């Protein structure tokens, strides 16, 4: 129990320095400038932002997870989530087995848990995937950029007698041959144009021996903000987890080895929980953006009426300075934690093997981000290893800033206490 301040400052010389800085407007103003520069490093920059790298990493882990396991995943049935007699529904630009499409053609079995994914779930998954892959290919924006958009186009086909997954009821489109329809939804308005075309079995250059319907979806104005893309990634991983369909893998000779070889997708429990946790932490991190913006530190502080600065009365700016500095530190810490959730250096057993042998691997013959080839399947193809590396580099290059943020936080905390 320290009773007296000289005694307390004898033992803790750095506290003495802190008190001296807190009474000095030019040391306070210098810390506030530091916060403006570090905020810009976190929310304005990309490559050198730990926060940017961590967001990218959380999104890449979710996309990579589906690139690994999608080809193995059974799907099928008709539009109500019911079983089908003879429906083949194919989703393009998806990482199928030696294919840039995934085929849902499991009939008779009821869609559901440890069974095929329903086409309704697959459509949700697929849309999120297409959006994420288009954004990753274009490049994610800095965290402060909240109004960019991307355009996304994707297609799927239906064949087989009784297949209703491309019908008016499923699609919204009146004329199954040549009909088109537009709809919007929402604080950003995204416009979707859905169009349909029918190709007869014989007609012109029809590879497949028989007849099908093609659906094209074109989405304009899709928000590519960090928050919006993280919501897409959550939709992707959660749909997988909740639908929990049956899978059965093809293990290569030489290749890395997948255990188990057949099962249900939600059985990858450590993997899925990690990915969800990364997304959760990244959403919390991005959420600090508005705290930072709301408490800008660019206005200089000092006394009033030319009288000396009085740290007990003249410091109503301190609460906002503290909130800004704490929010920055929280961003940095959550960015770190996203990284450590997936970094294989601290993983063990089958989850480590999943990451090092599959997720942080790409078998495309590097292709840009968001590229789906006939060899994507069974590999992450989402720059996971490189993103972990870049996150670590950005953190090492944040050394000064982090100390400046702590010092600003401490100054502000001293002034909030004095003003109590």
């Amino acid at each position, epitope marked *: 129990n320290y009773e007296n301040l000289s005694k307390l400052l004898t033992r803790y*010389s*750095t506290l003495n*320095t*802190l008190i001296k*800085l807190s009474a000095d407007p030019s040391a306070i103003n210098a810390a506030r400038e530091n916060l403006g520069a570090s905020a810009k490093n976190l929310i304005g920059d990309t490559k050198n932002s730990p926060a940017y790298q961590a967001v990218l990493l959380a999104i890449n882990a979710a996309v990579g997870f589906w690139n690994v396991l999608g080809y193995a995943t059974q799907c099928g049935g008709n539009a109500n989530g019911q079983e089908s007699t003879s429906s083949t529904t194919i989703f393009n630009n998806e990482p199928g087995y030696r294919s840039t499409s995934i085929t849902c053609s499991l009939n008779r079995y009821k869609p559901g848990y440890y069974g095929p994914m329903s086409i309704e779930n697959f459509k949700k998954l697929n849309e999120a995937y297409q959006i994420l892959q288009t954004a990753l290919n274009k490049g994610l924006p800095a965290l402060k950029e909240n109004n960019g958009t991307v355009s996304v186009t994707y297609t799927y086909t239906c064949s087989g007698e009784g297949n209703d997954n491309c019908s008016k009821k499923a699609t919204g489109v009146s004329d199954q041959n040549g009909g088109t329809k537009t709809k919007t939804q929402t604080g950003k308005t995204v416009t979707t144009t859905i169009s349909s075309k029918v190709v007869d079995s014989q007609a012109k250059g029809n590879t497949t021996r028989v007849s099908y319907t093609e659906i094209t979806n074109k989405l304009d104005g899709v928000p590519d903000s960090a928050q919006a893309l993280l919501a897409q990634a959550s939709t992707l991983i959660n749909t997988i987890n909740t639908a929990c369909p049956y899978f059965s893998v093809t293990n290569k000779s030489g290749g890395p080895q997948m255990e188990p070889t057949r099962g249900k997708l939600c059985g990858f429990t450590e993997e899925i929980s990690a990915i969800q946790k990364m997304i959760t932490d990244a959403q919390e991190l991005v959420n600090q953006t508005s705290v930072i913006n709301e408490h800008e530190q660019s206005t200089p502080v000092g006394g009033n009426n030319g009288k000396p600065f009085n740290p007990f009365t003249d410091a109503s700016f301190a609460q906002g300075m503290l909130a800004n500095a704490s929010a920055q*530190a929280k961003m*940095l*810490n959550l960015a*770190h934690q996203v990284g*450590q959730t997936i*970094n294989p*250096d*601290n993983l063990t057993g089958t989850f480590k093997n999943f990451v090092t042998g599959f997720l942080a691997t790409c078998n495309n013959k590097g292709s840009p981000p968001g590229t789906v080839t006939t060899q994507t399947f069974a590999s992450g193809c989402a720059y996971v290893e490189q993103t972990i*590396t870049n996150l*670590n*580099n950005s*953190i*090492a*290059h*944040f*050394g*000064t800033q*982090e*100390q400046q943020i*702590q*010092q600003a936080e401490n100054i502000a905390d001293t002034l909030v206490n004095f003003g109590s």
Partner: nanobody
Amino acid sequence: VQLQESGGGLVQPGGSLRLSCAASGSIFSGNVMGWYRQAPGKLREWVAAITPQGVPNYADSVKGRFTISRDNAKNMLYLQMSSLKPEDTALYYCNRLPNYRSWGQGTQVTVSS
């Protein structure tokens, strides 16, 4: 768990010293690690950092004179200091980046004729 620096001492300007830092597995493994110093009348200053894969970077005040390294098999961090100057006098500390909240005791470096 913990952070334990050693190797400090009083030396002559122009001299050299090697600092060591023993870190627990949980602090060190898969983490960026770094050195810091706190000089009289000042707050703690960052000095150098090193990624798990071994990429070093440095504050301008020490670049070209100090070398940071890590030994991943033993959870040890090192700072080789050369061409030391009076201005390098300080308590030196290691930590991960971002920092674990409880610092070790640090090791005193004093440079003086």
